[model samples]
Target: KPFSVPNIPMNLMSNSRVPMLIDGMMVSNDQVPQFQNGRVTLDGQLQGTTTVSAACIARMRGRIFNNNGNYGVNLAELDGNPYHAFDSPAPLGFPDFGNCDLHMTFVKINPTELSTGDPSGKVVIHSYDATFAPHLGTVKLEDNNELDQFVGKEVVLELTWVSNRTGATLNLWAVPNYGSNLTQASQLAPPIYPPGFGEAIVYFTSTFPTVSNPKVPCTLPQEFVSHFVNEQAPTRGDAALLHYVDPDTHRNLGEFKMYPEGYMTCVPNAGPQTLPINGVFVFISWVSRYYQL
Candidate 1:
């Protein structure tokens, strides 16, 4: 396990460069990280003051009980031929973003030395349904014996929003205002929260985050922020967009234009030489919300 420093509120944070660590060793210092192939390691994780949706909290409590006084992370996956693992109205608690209608299931991260800083936390997400499981170069779970390959290995995390019924992509971070007009951006709709309710979206900084600070703050552009403010948003303030660049020439990278948002996986980036951090932690903390509105 790596040694963690004390928490500093985002209000207390600054534009000064934060320390860069690869395998717990400082490599470079940058005010914002540069991502050539959609990845960045951080000096610290996002520790937001907010908690997840009520359903997520219910599931988190169940997970803690199962661990016998220990908190461990359970594997989570985004189902393409999405099925309702637990519906919003189901007796069992599971997430089904309003657009999702209870089609999602997730487990929480309870990071404590007791839980073992399982640094290589990873989840196996399915991009296709049984109807078209193997198309689009996606993972076929039927023979997925290599699930161990992702265990404890770092990979960039993304929250891909798509039609729960069709699996069409609606990734906000990928396009920066992808969901701006998708919904009213309502902070909280009574009947049930809209998936496009940008203000309440819970982005993942770590698949397995500690109890004290579950999420790390993200620095996004105005477009991303507009969803929340322009008739749609969260009260949490926005941070500056981290100008990620090409490690060699220092040229900046743009919005994540990778694999079709819905078909992508937390795949490890190829070509080790191009990266500045030598794979101590391969997973980049990507902040994006999935909306099916």
Candidate 2:
């Protein structure tokens, strides 16, 4: 008793009801974080004896928030399935035209960037649901040496129609060894605005000073234009016939026929641009059946 100092209460070291203080503020006693014998649990109870490293915990916390959202990971990759953790629609990578709906987009480029120094810009005219009904057709051939060359062979027809700030343009391609690749081949129909009400069509060019200036002008063949004026349909006597060719080499093969009265119409500057500083375009394609030898 003469040599020992007074003993402090051991209870002071391990009391659970001790008050917590921070920055001179009296924190509630219950505000203190608790640890069971210096051990902590992420869950109410321990599930296993496996030790969780701080690094592991930090990595998990890192994924709690991310650019996409919760878990901050590609679900498709993690779960080995096509589960994307995104709110918007999935991106369509190289789209398949066969399984596609009427879809289109706009494009615009300034010639200044291209170093051309031109005062104008280029815009792509596009829409999946725009209108055009070209009198399209094909023909059967009688037996001949050249005709036999085509027999047992298929051909591909690629049709592209672009209408936008630059005006409207239609192009066709016939590729041997394939079939019609036009988007709407057999039953091409023009789009009708306001339902049941007939509207005039006009086509114009991007730049002004042309006859159809300030409008979307068309540059179709004169023969097709006449058919359009006469309100003819495909198979009408006035339908124009096109010569089929090797889309690659452009070698004349035979006639690509259309029915009389089959035509298309355009109204210049039908409407204002869908977007400022943007362009538009529409694409159609189809395939032809194999010709029997």
Candidate 3:
């Protein structure tokens, strides 16, 4: 009696950018992708029907699971800090965006294989209570030097917001940065959705869309939107910050790599190399009613 081969679990699935908040509004589980020239197209509807009533627009996009294809760990390097092994609720040592309640940035194209043509894709994220557990702070990307005329094309995402002394409403999310042993903390599949009622304030203004459509229409800029807040006593242990934007008017791109997940584990994995398709991820949450009259 000596064979041994029992560890078959594998069932994690839910990240096409992950966002579908019907009752409160926010839709798009799929369809809203277009990688251009080399191909990879989904075509139509990034949101804006104008009749949802409560205003809906949370986003999600996934395709790079990781059963050890090009290597491993495809969900955005599986979040930071020695791989951040689940028990969730990071920030205990040295990353504090003045104790940010919510912040999210975007630079995708990691994880590999979307073959409509192939130009590469794999750069994952999902944030909450993040003060740099590899939430990726201190970014000075391209610093005005204009990172060589936008490598593979498409780059428009400018996020800048910070505010919290006594204002409520905040929520920023990104998940899939899987793999952790933060001494074996563990809990990254589809959790972290706790915050409601006066929501603690989460106003947004990281805008970028001055008319440029691949579909119906666009133009959502109102003078560099930047705002922030998240304090119900949330200034975790490790804090950090180093912000800079104006990549030549928030479009200068180049220099990428936040490698962790043991550099994608290695098999055929091509998950991090200049990852960027439509770089524009912003999430600030709020929705409360009563608690501190």
Candidate 4:
């Protein structure tokens, strides 16, 4: 019948459904539905009875977050490269003693719980708890609004050492403020030894003689010298200089530097020689500038 018969219809027929099989198991239409473009809903419980081997679990755990609570993300990918935060008010001033508190919670998972997982010893979690109260951190002086209050103002420094009548010499220098310049030398005098300039700024030659040695006394003589300077007055941004005399050779050596409005003291030349030096030497210097308050 290689012929087209008249009255033959091509679109007339009734279709019937057939059962499906997967791996020789009759797959029910209820268990496996038809494919769709979007989400698929599961009506029954989803369970896995087979245990994953250690190698498989290792590969799975290594894929995302680690047991140490560290995420598998690059540092650069973080929201802020180096972010920091601190608490408030308590530490808002100089010599501040503020309270800081930090809180965190951690959930630890046993390595053995992950069946067949590669457990490399015990896992030690690492984290940070940083809390720097307000104004409690390091500050640049130039940028410190509090320090600016003293600018164009005045300050005074006085030093006194207690002792018996002892002939002692002293020198002075203005040191660099590390807060301003970290590279600045912190020494009293860099080039000069027995550090000082000019004559013996402060000298006390023993007048009353010791029981054994009469020349050098146990008590200081009425004759004594004191050096005072207003060089640091009107503190400026420039470094201050001090001149002193070297006691070793009785030679003056000074012009050492220090921070503006700042001060330091040292035993001029070789310090006190002779005993019973009971008393004190007071070095007082003042700084006055043209600023209100």
Which portions of model 3 show Cα errors greater than 4 Å?
1-69, 73-200, 208-293
lDDT of 2 by residue, 30-133 (tens): 11111111111111121111112211110000001122211111111111234221311111011111111112221112233344443221111111221211
Q: Cα deviation in Å at residue 168, candidate 3?
A: 29
lDDT (CA) per prediction: 0.21, 0.19, 0.20, 0.18
Please give the lDDT score at residue 209 for candidate 1: 23
lDDT of 2 at 5: 10
**For candidate 1, lDDT tens digit of each residue in 96-160?**
12221111122223344235533332232332232111111112222234334333321222322
What TM-score number comes out for model 4?
0.15
Instruction: For candidate 4, write residues 1-293 as lDDT tens digits.
Output: 01111111111110000000101111111111111000111111101110111111100111112223222211110111221112211111111101111111111123333355432221211111121211122211112123222232211111011111123221111111212222221211122122243212121222221122212200111111001121112333332233333333423343223322122223333454422222222212222222111
Report lDDT (Cα) of residue 205, candidate 2: 22
Q: What TM-score would candidate 1 get against the native?
A: 0.19
As for lDDT, the candidate ahead, 1 or 3, is 1
Please give the ranking of all candidate structures by lDDT, highest first, separated by commas: 1, 3, 2, 4
TM-score of each: 0.19, 0.14, 0.18, 0.15
Candidate 3 lDDT, 184-280, residue by residue in tens: 1232222212123222111112222111211111111111100111111222211111111122344423211101110000111124543233332
Best by TM-score: 1
Give per-candidate clash totals: 11, 44, 64, 27
Best by lDDT: 1
Better of 1 and 2 by lDDT: 1
Indicate the worst ten consecutive residues by lDDT in candidate 2. Answer: 56-65
- Which residue segments of model 1 deviate by more than 4 Å? 1-96, 101-241, 254-293
